[PDB]
Assembly symmetry: D2
Homo-oligomer: 475 residues x 4
């Protein structure tokens, strides 16, 4: 067996000094003074569940093109950053959900760590309604992604979204929402181009924070009417956060996911004099005024935002240059898989903004519970997968594209110092990273099947029935 | 001339004892000890600007039939309750805005008091875009109404609304919005019918307060992006009020209009064992849980809601009964023209919930300023129209359909006691009501023309320009193309 | 050993079917198909950590008399309702904190389950400052209670509270607060008595919800300035909840504790025509308008309120009658120990308002973590104390004073039906309740020692240091003096 | 007579082109095409009610010393800035309110424009309770100022404040409150000095925004329980604003007064390397983080803050230097009388943040209505005092201590450009300023008497009676 020895265990539940013994890809024992044939030195370190990043777009077809990190490079980057599972979005074209799922299975051959998919609902009709049942009950996928923006490509309207959320409620599945008002965005994009305001910074101008706050509020109302929880992906601003807080104060089951980029980077990047510098940071929602960061961090501390992710969608500088002269043609996305946990630890844990237990909650455990795969993932418990990071709080670096795992040529965290990095990362007990030594195993990662109807969905359905309005009896 | 003698003047601006002299339809002199050829005794009374109710649907085609108060009976009802101007909604239809305007001119020939129109944008296209300019610049109408619900009948979507609001901004016009999410409401109606939940109470169940709060918050965002103020008609619940408060706290120019029905009546009317009683109150937004009333009153007192109206859209019981077995066929709407000012005075002024100056502000002056027609309307000032109510704070009645001016057979304020009623109501100096004697003059009312660009619109356009995001000047922009 | 067999384990962390093996007062093994010398049948049952109720006043000197549930009857009542630990408030007095502690040790010798204390800071000075260190470091108590009301009896002011909270921050201890404005309450009590408004309902009138919201918001500001978390006991209204939500939205470490009474009972009890019935419910904060309940439930579901408690402070009817003619002399307090978990399960879990995991979190695990005693308490984990309830979701009763464990003559939950009750309650592995058979062991309970500096306190101190405002380095600082 | 000719009248009520005729210190006629023996050219100008600044401390004894602008220099500065009335705080020592009022009458001999007083309640007891009746009914003063801070000097506690607010309710008077928690401030001051953090910037550190937000909320609750409106002086931060907004959303009668300094200046002044620069800006509440300004401006636009003032309390650099080595010894206060309307116009009206009508509302009319002296003051109506400013929207300057009316040697608005300045200022028809020509008349200003029970106070008392809880009738 392998024993991670001499460290302090940190989970979302508690912190305690103990050794961890791993065999057959599982945690088999946790206690003091354990001995195994192989020992990993965790003295001076924190031993935590491997990160789960539920928001990736590896080898994604988007905006005329394909992201430049694929399943192999994305999962390798994830492991180098202490992350041991990714959840990627399966993205249909009036194409079948089932056809899209087959294509995503094909893309994921070469995965270095385990992985699952969300299924995107990119249009609406009888076929989609029928196939959702198959995806949930037969394919081990209990989340459906909806886009309120990307008019003419991926967007659904209120009527379609309501139908889809009702279906998710019936199936015990969870709708995820990209919340921006697509009609307002499409018009503002056209207005800015018409005015000649066509540079990378005009991407930010085309979709101000109010557009995201409105769309989040609207998705929350539709999910409340449908009787399902709802998850707001990449919550970037106070307006979206306020909508979630206000819904949760009414007892609504609404989850929120700030990206590491939105916690630690800001819109002044778009004002840089160097065109490439500004275009490289174009993503949706855009980096925001720095004033919004404090709201997102408070949400992580108080439990109104539960999950930190990256929306990892990486494009080379050459790809970003597709948008010279027209910001709507710059492929949207920045990468972050490898930098998520290191940034969150240095700027969140070392500063006291979040405890170490909260750091585990928002980097693995909460999402594992939300996707109904805890304690297989997101746990340090006997019987859990041995997806583990041994975190050395003193191991430091300056983040640089010169030393990253990502296949692209820049890094939006370039020049940020982090102190606290993986000493080891294990994926089902396979030591894949030892300090700067990368020893990942292509094809090791396996698809993680998920069941519908977590406790939160079952309770909400019961409460809706208790409170359902009744006909008045008359003569 | 005619002198209104011995009263206390109350406006939104101040309260003072003075006589008011009226000549040629206008206030010509205000001061002590005035005399004229005719005298109206205002001793013990408050002399206020005539009410302006900007939310009426007189002889309106709707839900298979027409509302049963027309311009004559609605303006007569208004005058009897101290209201001297109505603003009605011209409704097209893919029919020209100009053809709808002509139709509404034709409808309004027997009006007893003055009147104007809002133009509804019930569909979107190049013709509508163009005709909006003519409506604003040539036809004296500076407001455009948008319905976010009534799917398949009057509803517009986000894309249409955003186009329309940007055109409002360009023209210096003000968008009005019926804020409920029409797509959710249509699906909830169909679901309730399929379950057999088909009675009048299911109307309320089909459109809960959350769907109004969402739509109000959405219309506000779209107006903020277009750079125009926006006006949320019939704000009925705390969720819609919260959206307005949150937007105004950000400095957004958002107006809200609680109906007198939503201040003083509640959803328990729908739970009555009598089908007719419940159906008579069916309107959209529906009467709400009584808990919401305090929020709306607090908005009047604090300035986050500025206008009290009635959405006067009256149907007889037999018209309501079109919806026996199917609440989606009950014509939606209630009447309140004659009862607005009496209810607000008894339940708001006499209770101390609002001052007399606030009462004037939310029953005439604020809407006059919002519609850019102050001080011609909503004022007691020299040069203002002599639209006046002489209000006797001791004159009392129990409201009843047996005595009402409205042409329909019931009154949603049945049995409410009011103390404080018109002694005289004057429309451009014509005494049309004298203590319960109705002496209205058909066709006396005239269309009130309105100009665009009130101060609020001009200031908001300047602030948008000051804060407009600018391009960054760069050199050596890289090569592009697909390699 | 003893094996709890065939049940479903439910903790705040997860839900799973397994047996639980207990040895020497501790959980020694969790897994399938365990066997031991003794078996408890948990088939069809949920096996959860025993409740922890951190808010009791057992044999407490108060308002001219003493509460009538003592350590024995209160811990017996707790065990009967699935609760296996109480935390009581040691109350000095200018009497030493150490003398009060000895007094409370003496009071607790017959406890049936384990117990700990909070220390109340009822006055301020050098001796208190010093003794706080000894309480934290030597006596195993890491919480200090402060009363913002009970003027002339227990109340401290802003200056005392700020000194005390800074000392809490230094010692890694957590301040608890009874948040009502005592100065306003004292003047309103005197005013109501002077007007002849002297009945039990006037207790509620003397301390309306606004006075709780204000005091909660104030204690939060003082804790934020001292750099320690703060815990708001018996959060009863939306105004106190709003203050907590607003503070947590800023990232402040603020905890809130709704009582089961305030989740499920309301001020209409005070309007009962029977004087005894109304007086029995007199407590501070009083039962509130029922509208406030939804806010508190929503706090449990969303995490802005983390702990359900009872503030168990029981008086007989004849003790309540000390206040006939003068509600300020009705001893304040109600009991709920035995009814907390049964009420919360029927009205929260069975209705879907909270999940079973949330139910565990707000009845044991959150407070265990807040008091820094998890996982010894509030856990089902190997090595944890065997404080367990085996809960039969089908076992039902109507709550009644005729069958209760509490020593007093009535029950504020009289007539409430509950479905879901303990089959077994174990305290450190001792089966003390078996289906309505009470078999408690006096003196079995022991004091639970607690350490300072939970993770939340340490992280908050670090954040305060990272953000501490720094002097600006200047040269040639000017001449001063009076010229 | 004198006719202000060719201008556009702007009041809080409306905007219209008309001439204004003045005779006997009053407006006697308003209309087109007026003629008088004397004409003031208002072509291209806006004709508005003279500003009323209800927050001044002229010749004030405070913190061991006396402010360096007295009634003559303060009222001269006010007129140069378009302001035609000041309301100063009469400040007793267990000294009688009536003795304090006599002293303030004596200080105000040399006033160039009209003036009134608020009476400060600086301690509590039977004498104070008795004298409040005399002040209201016999002395023409309907406001009482309370301090929640200045522990050991001016501070009252909750019990005293509640007693005083009940008395104000009975007398139809309005309590004003300096809202900071004095106990927390006094301790933080001592803690910072003990640490050696004793420079001017530590004044700001000693009283963070949360301390003001708490105190404002607490004053609002006490006034609600007492059944009187309440006015929160110098609302400087979002926390205080939020407390007012939340109270007003419940229907409470709460007024708020942002200073021009808090709308347009910020705490980075305290970080300046020059000791004098930083100390000169020390006042209470301190200049705040610039992020708070947007909240205050929104309040002016939406009606949740009603009155703009200056808290004019001017000290020479020599006086500010009293506090070298101990920030608690720096006299608190900055001046602003002359710069209030010019700053508010350039940064508020010219930017579109407020309309011209709102500018009149928050610079004269609202406070005139709040103090129950409208339309004598704050109006352009026939019969109103001819307190008028003819405002030239094109007349511009850079604000400088070299050209100011204030007797001190610096100006916290130094270097700010303003475009829009008085062409004329009239005080009861006396032209006291013509462009840069100052021609003020010492002793012209007269005390303005005010009556109790404005409409808002009467209505609130009625509503409290309607809602008063009743005894239950029992057998
Ligand atoms: Zn997205
Ligand atoms: Zn994405
Ligand atoms: Zn409508
Ligand atoms: Zn309508
Ligand atoms: Zn208490
Ligand atoms: Zn207690
Ligand atoms: Zn002050
Ligand atoms: Zn002051």
């Amino acid at each position: 067996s392998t024993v991670i020895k001499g460290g302090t265990i940190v989970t979302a539940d508690l912190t305690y000094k103990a050794d961890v013994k791993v065999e057959g890809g599982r945690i088999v024992e946790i206690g003091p003074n354990l001995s195994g044939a192989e020992t990993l030195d965790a003295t001076g370190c924190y031993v935590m569940p491997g990160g789960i990043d539920p928001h990736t777009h590896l080898e994604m077809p988007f905006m005329g093109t394909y992201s430049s990190d694929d399943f192999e490079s994305g999962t390798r980057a994830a492991l180098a950053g202490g992350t041991t599972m990714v959840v990627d979005f399966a993205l249909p074209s009036g194409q079948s959900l089932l056809e899209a799922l087959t294509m995503w299975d094909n893309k994921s051959t070469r995965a270095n760590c385990d992985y699952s998919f969300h299924m995107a609902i990119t249009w609406w009709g009888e076929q989609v309604f029928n196939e959702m049942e198959t995806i949930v009950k037969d394919k081990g996928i209990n989340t459906f992604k909806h886009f309120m923006a990307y008019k003419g490509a991926l967007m659904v309207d209120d009527d379609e979204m309501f139908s889809s959320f009702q279906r998710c409620a019936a199936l015990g599945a969870l709708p995820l929402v990209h919340a921006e008002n697509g009609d307002v965005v499409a018009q503002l994009q056209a207005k800015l181009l018409a005015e000649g305001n066509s540079g990378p910074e005009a991407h930010a101008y085309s979709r101000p924070a109010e557009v995201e706050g409105e769309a989040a509020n609207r998705a929350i109302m539709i999910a409340d009417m449908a009787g399902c929880p709802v998850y707001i992906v990449h919550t970037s601003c106070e307006q979206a956060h306020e909508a979630i807080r206000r819904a949760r104060a009414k007892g609504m089951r609404v989850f929120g996911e700030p990206l590491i980029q939105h916690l630690t980077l800001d819109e002044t990047e778009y004002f840089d004099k160097d065109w490439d510098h500004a275009a490289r940071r174009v993503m949706s929602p855009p980096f925001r005024n720095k004033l919004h960061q404090d709201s997102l961090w408070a949400g992580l501390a108080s439990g109104s935002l539960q999950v930190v992710a990256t929306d990892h969608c990486a494009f080379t500088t050459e790809q970003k240059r597709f948008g010279v002269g027209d910001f709507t043609r710059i492929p949207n996305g920045t990468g972050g898989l490898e930098d998520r946990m290191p940034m969150l630890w240095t700027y969140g844990v070392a500063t006291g903004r979040i405890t170490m237990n909260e750091f585990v909650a928002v980097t693995s455990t909460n999402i594992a519970k939300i996707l109904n795969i805890y304690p297989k993932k997101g746990a340090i418990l006997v019987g859990a997968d041995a997806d583990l990071v041994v975190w050395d709080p003193k191991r430091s670096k300056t983040i640089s594209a010169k030393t990253q795992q990502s296949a692209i040529d820049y890094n939006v965290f370039e020049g940020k110092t982090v102190t606290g990095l993986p000493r080891f990362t294990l994926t089902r007990g396979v030591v894949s990273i030892e300090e700067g030594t990368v020893k990942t195993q292509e094809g090791h990662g396996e698809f993680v099947r998920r069941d519908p109807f977590p406790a939160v969905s079952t309770a909400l359905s019961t409460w809706k029935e208790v409170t359902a309005p009744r006909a008045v009896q008359r003569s």
